[PDB]
Amino acid sequence: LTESNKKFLPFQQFGRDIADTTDAVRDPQTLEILDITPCSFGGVSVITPGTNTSNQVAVLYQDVNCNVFQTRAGCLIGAEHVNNSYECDIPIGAGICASYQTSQSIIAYTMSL
Amino acid sequence: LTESNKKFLPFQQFGRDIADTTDAVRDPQTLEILDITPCSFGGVSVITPGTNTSNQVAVLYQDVNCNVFQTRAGCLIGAEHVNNSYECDIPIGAGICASYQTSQSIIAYTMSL
Amino acid sequence: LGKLQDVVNQNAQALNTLVKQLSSNFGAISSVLNDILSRLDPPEAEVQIDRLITGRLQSLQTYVTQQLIRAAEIRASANLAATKMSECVLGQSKRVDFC
Amino acid sequence: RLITGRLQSLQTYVTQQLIRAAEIRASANLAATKMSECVLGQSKRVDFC
Amino acid sequence: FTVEKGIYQTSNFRVQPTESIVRFPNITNLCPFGEVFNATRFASVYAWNR
Amino acid sequence: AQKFNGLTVLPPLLTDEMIAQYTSALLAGTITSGWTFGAGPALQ
Amino acid sequence: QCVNLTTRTQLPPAYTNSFTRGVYYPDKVFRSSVLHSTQDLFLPFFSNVTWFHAIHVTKRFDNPVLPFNDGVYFASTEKSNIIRGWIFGTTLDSKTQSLLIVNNATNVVIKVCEFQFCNDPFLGVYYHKNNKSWMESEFRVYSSANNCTFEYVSQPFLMDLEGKQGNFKNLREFVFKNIDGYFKIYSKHTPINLVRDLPQGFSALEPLVDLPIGINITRFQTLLALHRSYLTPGDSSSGWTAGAAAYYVGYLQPRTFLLKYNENGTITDAVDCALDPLSETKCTLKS
Amino acid sequence: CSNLLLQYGSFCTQLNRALTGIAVEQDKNTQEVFAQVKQIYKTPPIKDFGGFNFSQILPDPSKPSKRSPIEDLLFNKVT
């Protein structure tokens, strides 16, 4: 229930959008307009280096907003972020891939064209 | 119930077609063979010159037999017919389009290749 | 631009139709599955729930089929664009009325 | 149940017609390329025209 | 038993709420009942106000 | 026929006469100009 | 109690045309930048709507018991608050629950009961001699009453009891509906400077009070207020004055309407689907 | 609702796999069109190409975005 910036006419209680979903209900406490946004978005995903190469994995959430790196394509945990860029093999999205490089661990970086 | 030109054997009452639809029934009153044909054919269509160009529209009937012009693609009302030919923009079907030209009103003509 | 606008408008209207499908009862007594559970017992309201399941499954299957056909058309157009790039862009093409 | 059966038959017909329309679109694109190349000029593509 | 390199979708993440608020109004109305106690004078025990 | 049950058949935009006219125009262009008419103005 | 009138020369009712009027909010939700279509009883656009006069200069006074269909549209270009209120019912013989929504000089009074309704109730305003103010004295709306349950007062509403013959300065529109016995009120005061031929401008109608009565309704009739100055003898037989007023009565029909919600959240346009082929084309494409 | 969905879990498996395949096919389309070369060639600082003006298709350093003025006009034209 976020704080909205749009005022309501003084006879309405509900509120919908273009896609016809109730996302703005006026709170009857002191006439506050509050938006509605679902808390659960997308699913989970895993990054695996493969067989005969490693044993650890990196869990990636599709669009959930939070070692831990806040990528553009959700939340990626278990993979450190490095500023340099190489050619990428395992795609994730939004120009960021993951790879197993140098011990050695799973790293995330912006791909090189 | 049109006047048919095909006679039945003197033991039948109904008549079907290739598509297996009862479209011929003998009249018990005078042993007259009458055909059956549905009346409602197709839908309606609206010819609009566009926003900020005109306000009047032309209504086209799809497969209905009837200012008013009997085109080969149904019935067209609200658009006068002119014998000359220009390049057409709004397609209708059967080689005749409609447009808004010179006041100015909606006209229908055979398209120029 | 006509080609670039249709591929977005069609997807947006398909998503809107998918949203609109949940507002129908598909022959049941309610649209939202919570209302029948709150007003009727689950042993009796099982057939309405199953009817809603079948309706939502049919709508999702139709959406998946439409998206698959659209993806096939996009694949064909992308193959055409890749060939056009590799011929007309990465060199000069002798094919007349192709570039 | 009559509504559901007729809806299923119509949906299957629409899917079949959409697949046929996709195949017709591919054939028409091939015919358009052939008209642009073999007819509106001489095509150097061997075993194409 | 063998997994190659690439992305894989296993399950979904759902944020289950832990608290519920169902309070419809901010306060309810009242009826005049304080005059039973806030009165100029009261009644006796053989004939009391009902 | 197949139209009695609401299964209306839409007539095509271009008739067979117009298609024949297009083919004859293409034939005349390809015998009188070769490929110049397909990539610009027609040259005799 | 009520008295009977005397026969006199009146004027036949006229017919006028509406111009994008009779649009209200069909619900109580908020919609912004969306074109939402709903199936509800509205007033069709460009429809021949009835007209009734209330001017004196002659002696025009017509209050027929019009049938109350599924929703009515009541628009008035009121200037000096000559009109007072409305009454409802089926037979008006103290057999059903007849409504009486009146607006007195102190407060609005809504009470549906079984009033002994007369043939032609009206409000009487008398001009005092020592006091230079118009005051209502003849409260002849019904003979008596027996029993009822609902009564509503709301906030006080102040009006002017002085009637003039000048041009109108305000326009008031009212919509009365009954769905599942639920009484609906929609109104919005709109200033205007005109005498007739209502403008083509657009103005939605917001609900004011929503009455849970759950009764029957088939007929309705409006109430009017006449003045008793020193010019008239003061008897309600042939000499009176009613100022200058005009109220329009329209009947709502079930048509789908495509509403135009702006970013603020108010209706701007009400393009139809069964009036013009162009309007049908607009509302089928949702644009 | 979930308990009755085990009777149609295979259908959801096919639908999810079809959507994943559609997404990866859309992802592969960009690699087949724009990734024709594996070496990024830099535009030369000399703009004297014999009189050919290429500023309308080459990127400009005046804006932070790398899009050409034609591409920037193309991005705002579509929604």
Ligand SMILES: *[C@@H]1O[C@H](CO)[C@@H](O[C@@H]2O[C@H](CO)[C@@H](O)[C@H](O)[C@H]2NC(C)=O)[C@H](O)[C@H]1NC(C)=O
């Ligand atoms: C290449 O074309 C561009 C057109 O965009 C030219 O830029 C314009 O130059 C004129 C002349 O000074 C200015 O008035 C315009 O404001 C410029 N427009 C823009 C968008 O920059 C550019 O000068 C041309 N360059 C060459 C070498 O011909």
Ligand SMILES: *[C@@H]1O[C@H](CO)[C@@H](O)[C@H](O)[C@H]1NC(C)=O
């Ligand atoms: C909240 O309740 C108080 C009474 O304690 C009341 O005065 C106030 O108006 C209420 N706020 C609203 C209705 O927004």
Ligand SMILES: *[C@@H]1O[C@H](CO)[C@@H](O)[C@H](O)[C@H]1NC(C)=O
């Ligand atoms: C994610 O959440 C944190 C804290 O809740 C917030 O600071 C950040 O802005 C959020 N990210 C986005 C993209 O909204």
Ligand SMILES: *[C@@H]1O[C@H](CO)[C@@H](O)[C@H](O)[C@H]1NC(C)=O
């Ligand atoms: C990568 O190098 C840049 C160089 O300025 C620096 O700003 C950035 O913080 C570095 N990132 C990490 C993760 O070390």
Ligand SMILES: *[C@@H]1O[C@H](CO)[C@@H](O)[C@H](O)[C@H]1NC(C)=O
């Ligand atoms: C119809 O009935 C009338 C009276 O019974 C009879 O005269 C006539 O012949 C009949 N026609 C037929 C059976 O075709």
Ligand SMILES: *[C@@H]1O[C@H](CO)[C@@H](O)[C@H](O)[C@H]1NC(C)=O
């Ligand atoms: C349409 O109807 C008229 C009169 O009913 C008739 O003369 C005309 O031949 C009909 N048109 C066709 C194509 O049959």
Ligand SMILES: *[C@@H]1O[C@H](CO)[C@@H](O)[C@H](O)[C@H]1NC(C)=O
């Ligand atoms: C168009 O011109 C031809 C030329 O003979 C004539 O026969 C025809 O009637 C004309 N049509 C109209 C609508 O004037």
Ligand SMILES: *[C@@H]1O[C@H](CO)[C@@H](O)[C@H](O)[C@H]1NC(C)=O
């Ligand atoms: C009675 O009066 C006192 C003081 O006037 C006030 O505080 C109280 O709320 C009233 N009601 C009751 C029930 O005591």
Ligand SMILES: *[C@@H]1O[C@H](CO)[C@@H](O)[C@H](O)[C@H]1NC(C)=O
């Ligand atoms: C005026 O109203 C009558 C009755 O409602 C109607 O028959 C008539 O067509 C209307 N006038 C016009 C010009 O539409």
Ligand SMILES: *[C@@H]1O[C@H](CO)[C@@H](O)[C@H](O)[C@H]1NC(C)=O
């Ligand atoms: C106005 O009329 C109402 C009844 O409709 C009545 O209750 C009220 O007392 C009247 N006001 C005055 C000042 O008489």
Ligand SMILES: *[C@@H]1O[C@H](CO)[C@@H](O)[C@H](O)[C@H]1NC(C)=O
């Ligand atoms: C009012 O009295 C009448 C008797 O004439 C009766 O029929 C009706 O039910 C009564 N109304 C109520 C609300 O009790």
Ligand SMILES: *[C@@H]1O[C@H](CO)[C@@H](O)[C@H](O)[C@H]1NC(C)=O
């Ligand atoms: C309401 O009136 C209708 C006829 O106008 C009648 O059929 C119905 O029974 C009435 N209902 C009640 C509750 O009086």
Ligand SMILES: *[C@@H]1O[C@H](CO)[C@@H](O)[C@H](O)[C@H]1NC(C)=O
């Ligand atoms: C509606 O609200 C918006 C945003 O505050 C404002 O720009 C606009 O002027 C408002 N409209 C009216 C009619 O007040």
